[PDB]
Design a protein around this ligand. Structure first.
Ligand SMILES: [NH3+]CCc1ccccc1
Ligand SMILES: [NH3+]CCc1ccccc1
Ligand SMILES: [Cu+2]
Ligand SMILES: [Cu+2]
Ligand code: NA
Ligand code: NA
Lengths: 620, 620
């Protein structure tokens, strides 16, 4: 009954039928993106209109189309031809991954480069890398992928251990032309293997780990109704899934007594970028937006019980469309479980004699995605005390290069001859806030140091200051760890029992933002990544910090264009966009497969409740 | 057999006997501190000399004594009379907690202040707060406590909800004189109770939490030998316990193949300070060093199975001395267990077809302490991949005041009439490093941004720079979150297979340091807390960042005096002191008992190993 339910196989088949009947999905068409649209502001009409947005690619070279479909009424709502030279290309198709390698294997310039290196072309894998926008005028309006090569000594070999440096090719995947092959010189192909399942590399496996058993003899404390509605320890929310963003959280709310209080209308990771800091011409163009260009949701793993998710696990299996509009299930794509989380609160009082201890727990909602060499886990946590936390776990295999003779200022050496270019992993969380409703505002809170003097004779005082962000033009903010800077989202029209506005405080990790030169192509295309915090006024069509079509867009779309409208955000329907990321100088310990590193953020109640919300938690 | 074993009841009884026989422990003497001394550098003689350091207080007013005892040979090694006016007073005695309230209850000025407020003196509890050093010349050389009052409506009432503001008293606890009573005016005593076990406050307890069962059907993967030596997943270490510092980690080392490699010689939290930022004369003197002044180890809780520690738990029960030299056990004072910790490493490879997943776990060593209103958990974590992490968990009851009419810039309002002054909780970790041995150095690592130009035509490059700290005078460092600043401890004489020095990287949380004016008394006494990182050359007697006798020391002892020696630290036996802390602006949700907040730091291998150290972990 819920308009926020997951898309079903039947809905996707109906979309495919509507498009077919309308003449929009013939045999030369491919679906590059398909997703349900959220209800507009004002779904209180209960008139359910399940609408889907579709990006349709044309393999014959005709212009692509953005189509909106009403599955409820069986109609096409709108269909617009896209000018990709102006507004950007469609996301990379899974079926284009092979095309780079296959085209190159019959190009004379590529074959000559391999022959000079004594490489068998049947061993050479080619990574299909997004192109970006640089100095090649001939690429504007064309669908380009760039290719970097790795040697596979045998079919179960890890190709990442054998980069072929000094070589890169550009391919037009629609017209099937190799447009350029660039060979800056021969580098030795690193010879050591990186096969982390080879007993010669691992040695004998440890026998010292004894089992840890986590069970729930009465089952879990959360309930799932309607397929994707979760109720857990006064929290209520809907778990969505989008092929671009992955897991999306809707209608996060907290039952405070008899009253269901909204906190967040929609939470997602709306973009992620991995820019590389190696100035070599072979890789200086390399920045992939795994979300916006590749769509991380369509690469979600099936998660195995007792390996990926441990404990009493409830799964969701989201449905997405393949390139022809057929439904395909991602079996066990989302894991859902609660975890013990240590001490919640504890006091032994010298005067009252009362000893008091309570335990914490958190609800975990997660998925894993794999795009090429990298693997990422996305984890949302809900805590008993009202805290909401996000954590990204980065693992997989680092992207490699040769390590030059005489060293490098921009590459780490991992093994003899083997390098790993410096890079960042930068995320954008899009938080459509609804603190006690939709009239919200953001204040920047700084610690204030005070000088010794009158009214502060002992020089011990310190304070804090809050600055309201009133218009979008002043709502692009930077971190300041030294002054303890945080941001508070409050509802100036809803007060707690002390007559203060209710709020939530955003705690950032204060890691470095985008390091590239502000005049670079990547600074223009990933402008969101240059600042820690952006606040916009809510609009239906402002969904991604980089715009709708990231692939080969020249720059400036998304957040810089949104905030230029300079709209009123003081007690309005607002959206918080938080940039956070890891700066990765690879270490020897990251090779041949990298242990998880993490980054994220959290939101804690700030006078949202009238006292601690966990006084009613029982003793274990 | 190990010189790092825990003190036993028999050893403490022998210390008591040696002191008695030597004439040093008559009936007017009290032991204010007793602890075993670590072996000197060069214990390879195997000549075990178990030595104990003792601070002996004299209740008759004679000068106190520092005594060193050899329990092995049954001799007093040294006994020095202390000039407390010069070098500081001894730590607060547990038996002095009562004395403040009892003396005040017969003082006419105190009784008059209570009568003006219509307060029953039999209801008024008085907190025994450390005095610091301020403008009262008459306190130099005297053992002073200051008292702040709270009303207990009945014996099981939480007194913290009823602060008596506008009133403070100073007491000489040796001569039993009330030296001053200060009454700046009447404030209403907040009337609401804060009794978090009162069903009228909690409402009916939740029935929705179902059990989480964590068991180890084959027992734990770690072994304990010799009472306190731990072996777990290639880690080896000794767990010590000191009445001042609490849990101390010794000889942390990692078995890399057939070779046992040292990492950290001694790890402890060597100080902690809670400075308050309320400029009111009633509280502007208030800064307690829970470690240095009160000794957090002697207030360690007995931890209950299934409440404080959940899972397959191994306990230690450390032994300490009471004020007369009798052994007393802290039953179940240290919990020890391993925990599942999610995904360790994961990759699904598009070219090799291999799917690979491994799970992480951590070894946990923790204790909890309670000093008055506050409770703290100290957690050390060891991870499979070589990471070492510390986490402090702060909970308990916030220290309260009245909330003034018309508001305050330095106090939060928690309930009608009830305030909580702003404060910080600042810790000092003392890390006696031994990375692959004792020849170590520290480098400060910053991200380096690069400008668009020749050699960086696309403006994408970025790098890093490392600066060696060569002398103590340049080894007082500040955080810089914006440039991603970390610190690497390396051994320039031990190289990994890539011929780079082995190292470990220290990752700080980059929270604000001490906020008080640099000319204040607390900035001088807690100088360690003004900077994030200090490096000293190892010396036997340089144990605490604040000096040996913190109580009523005028300032400058400890780290500023150590680093003034300007010793060589480039490839030497060094000690890293890391300051980290929480800045606490209390929120309504912290009342009436506060949910845990956390802070800490971690160290990760940086080219310590020749590849990932967890390739030999088996599939679950
Ligand atoms: N992660 C997106 C870039 C990529 C895609 C496929 C193989 C290697 C790298
Ligand atoms: N935590 C050390 C200060 C303190 C000691 C006893 C009661 C309240 C406060
Ligand atoms: Cu990385
Ligand atoms: Cu606090
Ligand atoms: Na909003
Ligand atoms: Na050392």
């Amino acid at each position: 009954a819920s308009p926020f339910r997951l898309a079903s196989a039947g809905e996707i088949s109906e979309v495919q039928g509507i498009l077919r009947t309308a003449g929009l999905l013939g045999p030369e068409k491919r679906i590059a993106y398909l997703g349900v649209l959220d209800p507009a502001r004002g779904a209180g009409s209960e008139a359910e209109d399940r609408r889907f947005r579709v990006f349709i690619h044309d393999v014959s070279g005709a212009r692509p189309q953005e189509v909106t479909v009403s599955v409820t009424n069986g109609t096409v709502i709108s269909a617009v031809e896209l000018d990709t030279a102006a507004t950007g290309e469609l996301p990379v198709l899974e079926e284009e991954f092979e095309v780079v390698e296959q085209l190159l294997a019959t190009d004379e310039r590529w074959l000559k480069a391999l022959a000079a290196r004594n490489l068998d072309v049947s061993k050479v894998r080619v990574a299909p890398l997004s192109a970006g926008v640089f100095e090649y005028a001939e690429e504007r309006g064309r669908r380009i992928l760039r290719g970097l090569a790795f040697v596979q000594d045998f079919p179960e070999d890890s190709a990442w251990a054998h980069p072929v440096d000094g070589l890169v090719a550009y391919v037009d995947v629609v017209s099937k032309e190799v447009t350029r092959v660039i060979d800056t010189g021969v580098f030795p192909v690193p010879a050591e293997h990186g096969n982390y399942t080879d007993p010669e590399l691992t040695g004998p496996l440890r026998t010292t780990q004894k089992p840890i058993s986590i069970t729930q003899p009465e089952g879990p404390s959360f309930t799932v109704t309607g397929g994707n509605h979760i109720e857990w320890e006064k929290w209520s929310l809907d778990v969505g899934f989008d092929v671009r963003e992955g897991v999306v959280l809707h209608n996060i709310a907290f039952r405070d007594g008899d009253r269901l209080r909204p906190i967040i209308n929609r939470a997602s990771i709306a973009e992620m970028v991995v820019p590389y800091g190696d100035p070599s011409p072979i890789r200086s163009w390399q920045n992939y937006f795994d979300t916006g260009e590749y769509l991380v949701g369509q690469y979600a793993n099936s998660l195995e019980l007792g390996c990926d998710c441990l404990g009493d696990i409830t799964y969701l299996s989201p449905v997405i469309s393949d390139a022809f509009g057929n439904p395909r299930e991602i079996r066990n794509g989302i894991c859902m479980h609660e975890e013990d989380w240590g001490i919640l609160a504890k006091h032994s009082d010298l005067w009252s004699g009362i000893n008091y201890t309570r335990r914490n727990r958190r609800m975990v909602i997660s998925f894993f995605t794999t795009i090429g060499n990298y693997d990422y886990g996305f984890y949302w946590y809900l805590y008993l005390d009202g805290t909401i936390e996000f954590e990204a776990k980065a693992t997989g295999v680092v992207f490699t290069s040769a390590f030059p003779e005489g060293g490098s200022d921009n590459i780490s050496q991992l093994a003899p001859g083997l390098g790993a270019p410096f890079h960042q992993h930068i995320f954008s969380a899009r938080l459509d806030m609804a603190i006690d409703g939709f009239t919200n505002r953001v204040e920047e809170e700084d610690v204030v140091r005070q000088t010794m003097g009158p009214g502060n004779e002992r020089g011990n005082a310190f304070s804090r200051k809050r600055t309201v962000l009133t218009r979008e033009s002043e709502a692009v903010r930077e971190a300041d760890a030294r002054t303890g800077r945080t941001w508070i989202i409050s509802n100036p029209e809803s007060k707690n029992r002390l007559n203060e506005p209710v709020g939530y405080k955003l705690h950032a990790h204060n890691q470095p933002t985008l390091l590239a030169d502000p005049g670079s192509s990547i600074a223009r295309r990933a402008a969101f990544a240059t600042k820690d915090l952006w606040v916009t006024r809510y609009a239906d069509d402002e969904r991604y910090p980089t715009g709708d079509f990231v692939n080969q867009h020249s720059g400036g779309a998304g957040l810089p264009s949104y905030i230029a409208q300079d709209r009123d955000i003081d007690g309005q329907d607002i959206v918080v966009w938080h940039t956070f990321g890891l700066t990765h100088f690879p270490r020897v310990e990251d090779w041949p497969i990298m242990p998880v590193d993490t980054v994220g953020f959290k939101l804690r109640p700030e006078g949202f409740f009238d006292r601690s919300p966990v006084l009613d938690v029982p003793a274990n």
